Amino acid sequence: PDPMMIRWVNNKMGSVVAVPEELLGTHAGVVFGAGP
Amino acid sequence: LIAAHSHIRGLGVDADTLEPRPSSQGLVGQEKARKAAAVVLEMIKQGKIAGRAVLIAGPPSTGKTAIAMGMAQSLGQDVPFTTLAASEIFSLEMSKTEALTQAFRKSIGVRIKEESEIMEGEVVEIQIDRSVTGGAKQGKLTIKTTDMEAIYDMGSKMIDAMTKERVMAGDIISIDKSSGKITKLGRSYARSRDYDAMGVDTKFLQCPEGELQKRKEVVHTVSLHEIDVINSRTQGFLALFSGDTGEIRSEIRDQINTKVAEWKEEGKAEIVPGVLFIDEVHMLDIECFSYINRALESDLAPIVIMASNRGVSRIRGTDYKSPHGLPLDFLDRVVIINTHPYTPDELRQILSIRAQEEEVDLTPDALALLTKIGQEAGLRYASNLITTSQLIAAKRRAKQVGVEDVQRSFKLFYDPARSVRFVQESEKRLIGNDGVVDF
Amino acid sequence: GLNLIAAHSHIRGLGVDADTLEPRPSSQGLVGQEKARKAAAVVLEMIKQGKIAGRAVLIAGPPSTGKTAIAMGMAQSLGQDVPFTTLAASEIFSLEMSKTEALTQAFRKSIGVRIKEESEIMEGEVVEIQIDRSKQGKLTIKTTDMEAIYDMGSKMIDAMTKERVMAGDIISIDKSSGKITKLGRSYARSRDYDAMGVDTKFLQCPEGELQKRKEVVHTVSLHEIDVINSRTQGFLALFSGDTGEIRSEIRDQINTKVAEWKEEGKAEIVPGVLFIDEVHMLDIECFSYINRALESDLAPIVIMASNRGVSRIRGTDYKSPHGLPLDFLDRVVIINTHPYTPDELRQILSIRAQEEEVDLTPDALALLTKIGQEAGLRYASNLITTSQLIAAKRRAKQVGVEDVQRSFKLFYDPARSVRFVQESEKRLIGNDGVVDF
Amino acid sequence: LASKQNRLGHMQIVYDEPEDKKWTPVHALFQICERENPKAVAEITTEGVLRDLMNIARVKYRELGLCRLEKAARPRAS
Amino acid sequence: ISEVRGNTRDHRTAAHTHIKGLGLNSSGIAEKQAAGFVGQCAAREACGVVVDLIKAHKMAGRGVLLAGGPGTGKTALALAISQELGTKIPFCPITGSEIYSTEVKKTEVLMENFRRAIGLRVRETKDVYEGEVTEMTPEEAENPLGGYGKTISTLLIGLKSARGQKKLRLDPSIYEAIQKERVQVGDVIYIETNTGACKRVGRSDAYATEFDLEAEEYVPIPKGEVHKKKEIVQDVTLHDLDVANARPQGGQDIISMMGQLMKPKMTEITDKLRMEINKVVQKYINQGVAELIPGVLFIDEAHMLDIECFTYLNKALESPIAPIVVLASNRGIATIRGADDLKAAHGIPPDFLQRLLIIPTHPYEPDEIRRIVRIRAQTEGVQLTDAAVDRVAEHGVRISLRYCLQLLAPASILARVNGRTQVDVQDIAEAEELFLDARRSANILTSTGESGGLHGFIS
Amino acid sequence: HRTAAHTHIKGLGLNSSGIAEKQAAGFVGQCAAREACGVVVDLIKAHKMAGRGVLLAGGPGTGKTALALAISQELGTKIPFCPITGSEIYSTEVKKTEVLMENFRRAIGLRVRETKDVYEGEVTEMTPEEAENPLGGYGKTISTLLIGLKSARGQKKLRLDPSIYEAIQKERVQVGDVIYIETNTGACKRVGRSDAYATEFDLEAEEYVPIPKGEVHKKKEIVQDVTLHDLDVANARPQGGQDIISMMGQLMKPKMTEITDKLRMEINKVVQKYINQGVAELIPGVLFIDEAHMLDIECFTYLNKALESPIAPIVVLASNRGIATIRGADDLKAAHGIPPDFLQRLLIIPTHPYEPDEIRRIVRIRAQTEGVQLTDAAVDRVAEHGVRISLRYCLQLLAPASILARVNGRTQVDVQDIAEAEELFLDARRSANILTSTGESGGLHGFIS
Ligand SMILES: Nc1ncnc2c1ncn2[C@@H]1O[C@H](COP(=O)(O)OP(=O)(O)O)[C@@H](O)[C@H]1O
Ligand SMILES: Nc1ncnc2c1ncn2[C@@H]1O[C@H](COP(=O)(O)OP(=O)(O)O)[C@@H](O)[C@H]1O
Ligand SMILES: Nc1ncnc2c1ncn2[C@@H]1O[C@H](COP(=O)(O)OP(=O)(O)O)[C@@H](O)[C@H]1O
Ligand SMILES: Nc1ncnc2c1ncn2[C@@H]1O[C@H](COP(=O)(O)OP(=O)(O)O)[C@@H](O)[C@H]1O
């Protein structure tokens, strides 16, 4: 539930990136497929 | 490769009696100066006696630099050995005296010992939190050996090293906790079949056993000049490599000497005194000697060994002559070791050593002719004739060199004794101190 | 208007026939030096051909005979195409760069690179900035003839924001690079504000079509390319002078790429002329580098001047002809000059008269010819101005015998100054002692 | 300069074909030393055998422990 | 943009244009009138032995002197060696009056020229993804992390080169590149392999007209591969390693962005740096990656080096990694520039002279100057009759060698101005009075130039 | 533990009545020089000195600098003593008179009490409070903070300037870092994470220290030993404070500059203000210029005005020259290299050569100082070499002759070891004789003349 930090976690299965909900409306979600 | 002093493997004396062997470890053919240099080497390895001066005087091409490299190979890579030439001191950046002071303080090693903390094990997961458009980073590293399963935290520099190394899940890394370097040793799994830009499959290592936090005691040797530069400047480090050090004031040296004495008493540091070799000291002027005579007055002066070539020469920056070009208030302090010119039964075996080093096979008639040439032109022409005759024998496809190859090389390349006559014959088509004509 | 009548102002080119190389005497200012001018014409015709690289041409002779005159004639009779470089020898002895590098830059200036291209620029006055805060926008620009509306997408709106373009500016966009260069404001908006800022300069409106494309012929030198590639924003260094010992690896890369441009047909190499005036001031530490820099393919046809007889070479202590070392004089070719007959002196003074628009009676011209024969050219040419000025003080149109004799009475030629010095030795500070009467 | 993304280094990485005849943009033609630079090719290589030569001063400066060593001298007045 | 001119791609004639090599046999015996040279047999044989020494990698700090008078062919033999060795072995032709600097000591520019003379060849690989971006489409993970919004497990990029396109699955931590570099659809990028962080080169040329005014560089599509697995040979001189370790090129702060913004100053380099670089290059040779290639430091006009430089040269030549030093001296008994005491041969001190393989150089016979004239004339293209050749050879024997090679250009100019194609005796007899030698110039200077007066020289 | 050339000297060895007793505390003989040096030492320790000239004449090898180390060990630790040479002042950044004045003000010391005001706490809440920032290019600017320090007994919640915030910010102070803000400059050194956040599962290699006990606003006094040249360098190149001149002035490379007359007078007035407040104590010292004949005439000109100052240390010159030519102007010869005008300031102390028994005593002291024991016949042999050849040649024949003794299994040095070391290691005179005799002609086996 962080305001502006984007998590990267890499385990033995794969590696995923979590984005907080509060950043999806911003310009940071254009790569992740949310956008303005 | 094969330089002019690659056959030498030390000084070649005894360890109990230090008697000069007539043929041992390259330096073959001289006994007095090698025994005296063995005595100097033993009082350098003692390390107690500080501030002497050894002057290896003698004719040129007699092995003075050979004796210096013999002492250099005999100390090993522990004691500093500065190979200073006398013309390097005349800088335009810094003063002429401060270059000498740096040349003395480069030859006093300080050997300190410190404990680092190294890790070992297989990375299980990386967890990196990054901001958007500038900001701090957060890091959690889960690492596992065969016994422990730790979840460590990370700062900014550790993440800046992880992303530089690209440490994925399933790597055998070892992190020094103090210095903060990361060396990947290999992997335990295989390469995934899900991503494209992964990399190269590294060495297959198993999971390391033991513990995570292991301790290590490393030994670091820095000269006093490096301590002077890192303690003379606030941010301007790395100037001890790029030579950008302008001047170090005396308030810095008189504090670093006291702190090195305190480190010596505490058992933290140990002072290893070293050798300052000055090649062809006759080029220094009297303004250098008036400081060299007084820098050999303290507990932190290295045992100076230096060479010379000249007879009664005039000292630069003055108007008068002296033996060896050195002033007679400085020649009282020094101790002069003479070297003698060689004998042909020694030139024969010296050329044999130089031939066996450059991988050149000979015939005894060619070696006899080569010794006859070396009697009249020195070793410096004969060794060049050895290499040249090797390649001329390689051009005409011969196994061993012969008399004809040596005569060919003697015909092509003049020794200086014939080039002097070549100057003295045709003086009208060479620019003297005057005009010249063209046919 | 920053152009006043100097000594070298009547020499409008070399003045020889371009067909058969015949130096007719009174043409383009120069007068009667036929063999040296013929030899300079041969040199100029092997300069414009540009094939034969790195000669060296020394111009010896007495002073006041015309050694820099022929050099300025060769400079004028090339045009702006082939370069030329007036470097007196005392410019080399600097305190920021050494003699070798400051003489290498003299060779690097005299070789041009010529490249022709098409500039796709757009002038225009801003009318209305229309930003659609929805990314898109519209820019309305006008000239004295046209007016158009061009679309904009995302980022040059931000370039407008960083440039702070208001309605009324004169913007220019290089569409091959895409960067806004605000040229100022227009005179149609000087009535608007009252207290202007500092940075604002007023300009006329652009005229003609917005999209201007034009084929322009750029000509740079190799020294330009060397100094621009020295450091990051290093282009201002060649105006300022804040450069030093440029490394040899940069010059090696630059010569390799100029050879590559000549292979690919982008560039044309134009070799030029280096003019080393008063070469006897160079010491032997400079001739030892000139003897090697005249060997490469990229070396200009060096033309040098000299005055001195059998003199010492600076830096050493042995005499030599022309103040030059003999290993250098085996390499150069020498064009000797000669002093002037009075028949040439009269018309040289006539040309210096008609250059300075000073009218002379014939008796004054004959008297001035005799003064020039007895004292030299540089003193006779300095009496035309003085006689004109003394005639202007007593309000006479034509100068006469009286004004020239007045100018000869007032100012001393260098022939009589030596007798004035040797006449009164006890008061001039010779080397030791002064009497002071 | 701190907010100018260099790109003429990257031209040597991408546009690196013999057919491509060493393409450079015409508005950046004279910046030759910006364009052919071995550091830019060095930072891309699989083995870092040239990257371990280009900054060996930092590696030797770190491995001697000249950072963790206690600062012996300091100025006597400020 | 830049308009290409369709002219003739010729070259320029220097003084050593006709030299194309030594011109030896397969046994080393020289042969006269071959590859530009005329005569000079023993010097070309000795230089062939030097060339063989250089290509055999047994030279490790030798030294070769070229004696002989001025205008006899020392620099000709130097350029012959440099064209005989090729291009992939370095060659740094400094002069004696090029060590004198005003930023560093003069025993340092010598060492930097040694490091310019040594080359290092490195063979490596280059693995990059390349081309214009078509899609940036994410993919939702199988198990999203609780407490967050989107959870993306694999990011897809469609890269299209000029030959073929390819879809690419990537680790999701390419996003920090794409947000920081502003990569969009239609921007060529390259993705490396060791780290994997894409860096945009520029907007492509196909999208150069979707807008009208918003312009930047419009780089074309990469006309090549999409997956480069290309190997690279790379030649770096050790001078370049010394500079890049001493003064770092690209940093991210204020003061290194003033260091490259202010003028680069030559600084003296401490010897620990050179010792470390030698110790690590000799380790990478033993791993079998890099090849050391020594070159030639042709120090022309070696009598301009003073006595403070040969002392440093003795140290520098005793180093285990050093190139050959081909000196070039044209003086007899000369005073050494530094110490004005000893009159030594060639300007070289007698201590340094013993290291040197002294190669002589003899004057030319009076029937070889005309062969040099024929070769120089067919080099420039200036053709001329045989009596003209004999007259130029007469001027060559009686005056100088360099002077008879300079009566060919004004004779050709006067020939094609007078209305002919070949040079006759009249054109050279006319051009011999427009271009005087040094001898008649000194004759005019002494005879006519009697003393300093009005119409006289300034002694 | 290294025996240098001057290790046996432990002082002048004077009686209570100032009379030099021979063979005491290192020296042997040399009465008229050691009594005059004792007079010089008590001239230093009485503070009625504002520039006095003391010359130490005498030939080489007679102990001119042994007297200097005797003075420097007789004055003590807390009196400044600056030894230089005559070749040290030829610099490349500044004129050499600047180096002379920098040595003159190295040779004057000051002992100052200072009251530092530390705020030694553990950071609890760090929150910036920016102010208004209109359109002026740079953007926002932090102007006020609310850092809460938490010591062991009584916390405090204080408010900061922008500059002290930048001092924090260039130290990377997070929440939990103990610091102590120095409210004299503004500097603030992070010490480490507090032990309330301690975790053995850590990687940053932080230094965990406990909470600083006591009041958070401490105040402590110290004593400092500062020379006037230190104040000159401090006011010349500023490296204290939190502004831009004193921050961009410690990233550049340090250069010796020319501290002018006005700064050297203003710092004198500041030090007089310290002394009048009853805080600082002035202690003048010695400038020992060894080898004064290497100084040229442009330095002996400036020493006149440097000694006319109301505050100037005592100068001790050493010069082993007879009638010689001054380095600056080569047309006036004088004694010692000193010009005949500057020589009148000097109180000239002579130094006489030694005797064949004093050499024996010096050899015995040097042998029992280095740690080389030997027999009396060997002592007589070394004294014979000392009479014939030189004084500081025969002292140096003890260090090989020990090692050679240890070659032959001995402990004490006999006649054979010195008879071998006199053949292995030569002096200068016999080497020059071999040079002149063997080096007859230049050639292959000759010497470069
Ligand atoms: N005693 C010796 N043993 C082995 N090599 C020697 C000996 N004397 C001379 N040499 C060889 O001769 C060369 C010259 O010796 P060096 O010390 O360089 O002479 P110089 O002292 O005149 O400089 C060296 O390369 C060395 O290899
Ligand atoms: N042939 C000529 N016709 C006209 N004016 C000439 C001629 N030759 C020389 N002059 C003039 O004489 C002056 C001296 O020539 P210049 O080359 O300056 O002499 P110097 O070679 O001594 O410097 C110049 O100002 C030039 O205008
Ligand atoms: N053997 C040769 N064959 C042809 N041309 C030669 C020969 N030797 C010398 N030259 C020519 O002589 C000219 C001058 O010789 P140069 O190399 O300048 O002598 P140096 O080496 O003494 O300076 C050069 O232009 C060269 O072309
Ligand atoms: N009175 C003395 N007692 C003991 N040793 C002395 C005495 N005088 C001189 N020496 C010795 O002479 C050596 C050189 O003395 P020094 O002061 O360096 O001579 P100089 O006066 O020429 O500088 C020193 O090592 C010191 O041990």
PDB file of C-alpha atoms in Angstrom, chain F residues 194-277:
ATOM      1  CA  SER F 194      20.570   3.860  17.097  1.00  0.00           C
ATOM      2  CA  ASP F 195      20.452   0.544  18.925  1.00  0.00           C
ATOM      3  CA  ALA F 196      16.661   0.698  19.239  1.00  0.00           C
ATOM      4  CA  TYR F 197      16.627  -0.227  15.542  1.00  0.00           C
ATOM      5  CA  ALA F 198      19.261  -2.927  15.970  1.00  0.00           C
ATOM      6  CA  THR F 199      19.002  -6.086  13.888  1.00  0.00           C
ATOM      7  CA  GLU F 200      21.725  -8.669  13.324  1.00  0.00           C
ATOM      8  CA  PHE F 201      20.136  -9.434   9.946  1.00  0.00           C
ATOM      9  CA  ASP F 202      21.716  -6.426   8.276  1.00  0.00           C
ATOM     10  CA  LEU F 203      23.874  -5.727   5.230  1.00  0.00           C
ATOM     11  CA  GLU F 204      24.774  -2.017   5.157  1.00  0.00           C
ATOM     12  CA  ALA F 205      27.619  -2.586   7.695  1.00  0.00           C
ATOM     13  CA  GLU F 206      26.388   0.265   9.832  1.00  0.00           C
ATOM     14  CA  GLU F 207      27.959   1.235  13.121  1.00  0.00           C
ATOM     15  CA  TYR F 208      25.370   0.800  15.874  1.00  0.00           C
ATOM     16  CA  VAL F 209      25.915   3.155  18.797  1.00  0.00           C
ATOM     17  CA  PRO F 210      23.636   3.615  21.827  1.00  0.00           C
ATOM     18  CA  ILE F 211      21.616   6.723  22.616  1.00  0.00           C
ATOM     19  CA  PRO F 212      23.897   9.577  23.744  1.00  0.00           C
ATOM     20  CA  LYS F 213      23.457  10.038  27.480  1.00  0.00           C
ATOM     21  CA  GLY F 214      23.045  13.446  29.060  1.00  0.00           C
ATOM     22  CA  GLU F 215      21.270  16.561  27.941  1.00  0.00           C
ATOM     23  CA  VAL F 216      20.625  16.945  24.235  1.00  0.00           C
ATOM     24  CA  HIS F 217      22.084  20.466  24.287  1.00  0.00           C
ATOM     25  CA  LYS F 218      25.584  19.840  25.603  1.00  0.00           C
ATOM     26  CA  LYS F 219      28.393  22.382  25.814  1.00  0.00           C
ATOM     27  CA  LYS F 220      32.023  21.322  26.085  1.00  0.00           C
ATOM     28  CA  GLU F 221      35.362  23.093  26.270  1.00  0.00           C
ATOM     29  CA  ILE F 222      38.596  21.905  24.651  1.00  0.00           C
ATOM     30  CA  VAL F 223      42.146  23.203  24.266  1.00  0.00           C
ATOM     31  CA  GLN F 224      43.623  23.567  20.773  1.00  0.00           C
ATOM     32  CA  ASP F 225      47.136  24.189  19.450  1.00  0.00           C
ATOM     33  CA  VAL F 226      46.937  26.376  16.341  1.00  0.00           C
ATOM     34  CA  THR F 227      49.706  28.227  14.537  1.00  0.00           C
ATOM     35  CA  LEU F 228      49.142  31.557  12.826  1.00  0.00           C
ATOM     36  CA  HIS F 229      49.716  29.980   9.425  1.00  0.00           C
ATOM     37  CA  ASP F 230      46.782  27.695  10.109  1.00  0.00           C
ATOM     38  CA  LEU F 231      44.617  30.780  10.601  1.00  0.00           C
ATOM     39  CA  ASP F 232      46.069  32.253   7.409  1.00  0.00           C
ATOM     40  CA  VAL F 233      45.114  29.156   5.420  1.00  0.00           C
ATOM     41  CA  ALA F 234      41.706  29.045   7.096  1.00  0.00           C
ATOM     42  CA  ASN F 235      40.789  32.604   6.204  1.00  0.00           C
ATOM     43  CA  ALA F 236      42.404  32.325   2.768  1.00  0.00           C
ATOM     44  CA  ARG F 237      40.649  29.251   1.363  1.00  0.00           C
ATOM     45  CA  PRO F 238      37.402  28.894   3.334  1.00  0.00           C
ATOM     46  CA  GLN F 239      36.290  25.363   4.090  1.00  0.00           C
ATOM     47  CA  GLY F 240      33.851  26.015   6.911  1.00  0.00           C
ATOM     48  CA  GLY F 241      30.217  26.987   6.887  1.00  0.00           C
ATOM     49  CA  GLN F 242      27.343  25.887   4.699  1.00  0.00           C
ATOM     50  CA  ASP F 243      27.318  28.467   1.925  1.00  0.00           C
ATOM     51  CA  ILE F 244      28.554  28.002  -1.639  1.00  0.00           C
ATOM     52  CA  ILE F 245      32.057  29.480  -1.528  1.00  0.00           C
ATOM     53  CA  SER F 246      32.910  27.187   1.366  1.00  0.00           C
ATOM     54  CA  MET F 247      31.399  24.152  -0.302  1.00  0.00           C
ATOM     55  CA  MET F 248      32.543  24.502  -3.898  1.00  0.00           C
ATOM     56  CA  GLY F 249      35.894  25.438  -2.346  1.00  0.00           C
ATOM     57  CA  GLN F 250      36.515  21.943  -1.015  1.00  0.00           C
ATOM     58  CA  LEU F 251      35.768  20.084  -4.239  1.00  0.00           C
ATOM     59  CA  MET F 252      38.491  21.866  -6.236  1.00  0.00           C
ATOM     60  CA  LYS F 253      42.119  20.977  -5.986  1.00  0.00           C
ATOM     61  CA  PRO F 254      43.929  22.854  -3.190  1.00  0.00           C
ATOM     62  CA  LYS F 255      46.474  25.394  -4.358  1.00  0.00           C
ATOM     63  CA  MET F 256      49.008  27.361  -2.368  1.00  0.00           C
ATOM     64  CA  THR F 257      48.140  31.024  -2.830  1.00  0.00           C
ATOM     65  CA  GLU F 258      49.719  34.343  -1.863  1.00  0.00           C
ATOM     66  CA  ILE F 259      48.292  35.379   1.493  1.00  0.00           C
ATOM     67  CA  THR F 260      48.761  39.139   1.345  1.00  0.00           C
ATOM     68  CA  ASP F 261      49.774  41.736   3.914  1.00  0.00           C
ATOM     69  CA  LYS F 262      46.240  42.753   4.833  1.00  0.00           C
ATOM     70  CA  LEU F 263      45.159  39.278   5.910  1.00  0.00           C
ATOM     71  CA  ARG F 264      48.387  38.822   7.863  1.00  0.00           C
ATOM     72  CA  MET F 265      47.639  42.027   9.739  1.00  0.00           C
ATOM     73  CA  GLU F 266      43.956  41.348  10.332  1.00  0.00           C
ATOM     74  CA  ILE F 267      44.683  37.920  11.793  1.00  0.00           C
ATOM     75  CA  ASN F 268      47.198  39.605  14.093  1.00  0.00           C
ATOM     76  CA  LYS F 269      44.447  41.908  15.338  1.00  0.00           C
ATOM     77  CA  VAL F 270      42.067  38.949  15.795  1.00  0.00           C
ATOM     78  CA  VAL F 271      44.669  37.059  17.827  1.00  0.00           C
ATOM     79  CA  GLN F 272      45.239  40.146  19.957  1.00  0.00           C
ATOM     80  CA  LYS F 273      41.491  40.227  20.566  1.00  0.00           C
ATOM     81  CA  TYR F 274      41.719  36.583  21.718  1.00  0.00           C
ATOM     82  CA  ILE F 275      44.592  37.339  24.075  1.00  0.00           C
ATOM     83  CA  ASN F 276      42.818  40.354  25.557  1.00  0.00           C
ATOM     84  CA  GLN F 277      39.853  38.138  26.419  1.00  0.00           C
TER      85      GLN F 277
END
